[PDB]
């Protein structure tokens, strides 16, 4: 909508599920907020999927994240507002990028796998 | 010295004594150009804000107000008088004179000490309070 350079941009149906997963990972200490921490997780190879926002006006500050995901074969998806993503991540400040890491025997494995599957069929 | 409020005529100082009930009126009688009076009119500067709750400081030039020289013995170069609810609070120092501090001191804590002691003894309803320090000497050695 606002930004044509939005490839995996998701609609207002699975965005609710994405934010629910973000909150649950927050309760489980299972996310890294911020573009820099998402990039570090991608570099370490422990990132499972990262969600960013299409409201950051210089989107190219976070447009290296989909390229890094393509390099590491990591699902990636956008949202429609940075404020909602930030508030869902567990912080008041607007966040434009968050990552979800791994956990041994995680109770969120089924939902994170479902989210990975849902995003991967939305690229086209 | 020059920063503290000044009183110009006889009526003003009597009003300043009368226009207050819940603090102590500390009046520095003397001449603000005196080396002695200027020594302690800066101590009274450095503590004017600190003792705002229970003390107000007015300055009086005896030449400008020649109405209290005879009655209160204003002939030492510098004099400090404490008043509470229109009542001169006598204070017992180490010196013989027990109605005034006729010398300019140097430490900003001792003057607040004396003012707070005067306030404490005046809330009770005394007329003569006793200073903590003894001024029968100068502790020099």
């Amino acid at each position: 909508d606002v930004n044509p350079k939005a490839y995996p941009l998701a609609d207002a149906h699975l965005t609710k599920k994405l934010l629910d997963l973000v909150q649950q990972s927050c309760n489980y200490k299972q996310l890294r907020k911020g573009a820099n921490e998402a990039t570090k997780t991608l570099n370490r190879g422990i990132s499972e999927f990262i969600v960013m926002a299409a409201d950051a006006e210089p989107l190219e500050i976070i447009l290296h994240l989909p390229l890094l995901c393509e390099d590491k074969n990591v699902p990636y998806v956008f949202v429609r507002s940075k404020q909602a993503l930030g508030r869902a991540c567990g912080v008041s400040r607007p966040v434009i990028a968050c990552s979800v890491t791994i956990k041994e025997g995680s109770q969120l494995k089924q939902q994170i796998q479902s989210i990975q599957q849902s995003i991967e069929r939305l690229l086209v | 010295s020059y920063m503290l409020p000044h009183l110009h005529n006889g009526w003003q100082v009597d009003q300043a004594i009368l226009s207050e009930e819940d603090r102590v009126v500390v009046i520095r009688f003397g001449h603000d150009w005196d080396p002695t009076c200027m020594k302690m009119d800066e101590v009274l500067y450095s503590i004017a804000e600190k003792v705002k709750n229970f003390a107000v400081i007015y300055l009086v030039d005896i030449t400008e107000v020649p109405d209290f020289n005879k009655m209160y013995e204003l002939y030492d170069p510098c004099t400090v008088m404490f008043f509470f609810r229109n009542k001169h609070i006598m204070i017992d120092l180490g010196t013989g004179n027990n109605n005034k501090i006729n010398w300019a001191m140097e430490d900003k804590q001792e003057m607040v000490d004396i003012i707070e002691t005067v306030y404490r003894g005046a809330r009770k309803g005394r007329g003569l309070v006793v200073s903590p320090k003894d001024y029968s000497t100068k502790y020099r050695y």
């Binding site: 570099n43 370490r44 190879g45 393509e70 390099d71 590491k72 074969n73 | -």
Partner: protein, 99 residues
Amino acid sequence: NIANTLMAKALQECPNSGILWSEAIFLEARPQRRTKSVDALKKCEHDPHVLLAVAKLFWSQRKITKAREWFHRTVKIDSDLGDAWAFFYKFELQHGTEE
């Protein structure tokens, strides 16, 4: 870049793989941030020449004592493959003292 993507995909598939984890830090990872990759590989408890990869990383960092200690650890039963013994022999022959 294609090799880096293939290495990332291989790491994503059964990361516990000793050979892939050992050959990732030394080959794909640059000397800068190689230590982080070395720690990530060491996060896997098993050391089938992974300790040898740590020894190679230490030798690249020119740490003689650390390289010798890792090679002694690598030459043990943890990484008892002959590659560790050959690397230890080469390093001892290439040591500054060579005594």
